[PDB]
Design a protein around this ligand. Sequence first.
Ligand SMILES: O=C(Cc1cc(C2CC2)c(-n2cc(CNC(=O)c3cnc4ccccc4n3)nn2)c(C2CC2)c1)NC1(C(=O)O)CCCCC1
Length: 156
Amino acid sequence: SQCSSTLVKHIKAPLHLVWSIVRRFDEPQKYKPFISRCVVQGKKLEVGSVREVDLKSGLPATKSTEVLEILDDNEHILGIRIVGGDHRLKNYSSTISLHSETIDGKTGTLAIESFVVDVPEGNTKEETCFFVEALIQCNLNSLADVTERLQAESME
Ligand SMILES: O=C(Cc1cc(C2CC2)c(-n2cc(CNC(=O)c3cnc4ccccc4n3)nn2)c(C2CC2)c1)NC1(C(=O)O)CCCCC1
């Protein structure tokens, strides 16, 4: 079986700033708190690019290997798929897109992030959804914190 879900985050920063962070397939650690390092060979932002991701020390896994499936700089879509690593996420893939919006009369960014993953042996579908959703929520919360802080720092 699989878990498939979508999470939404409202970010109080302009799209061009948020996208400049999200699009860096080679630097996920800039806002994903559980990631330490990341290396991409060749043209780092091309479809088919492979990133080797180092997780922070003290986790059950240590590394993930992930492929760039989509990078659309016009419509602000990033799609990735995990293809290796010493974790238990099999057939994980995700898409995040960003969209301009207006909340409280000010320009901001809507992030929509969807995933599909297999339910691993030994876990329930509910546990699998909860695990991935909590981590994506942590990442989207961190993306908002990072970009809203960059926004504040840029203002006079
Ligand atoms: O943010 C991250 C970083 C990231 C990436 C990874 C693994 C390399 C992929 C991990 N990890 C995972 C593990 C070991 N447990 C599993 O494998 C795993 C798989 N089924 C489960 C199903 C139910 C309950 C627990 C489960 N447990 N040890 N470390 C973490 C740790 C947990 C905080 C963070 N990853 C995502 C991203 O958006 O980049 C968001 C979350 C989904 C994957 C993509």
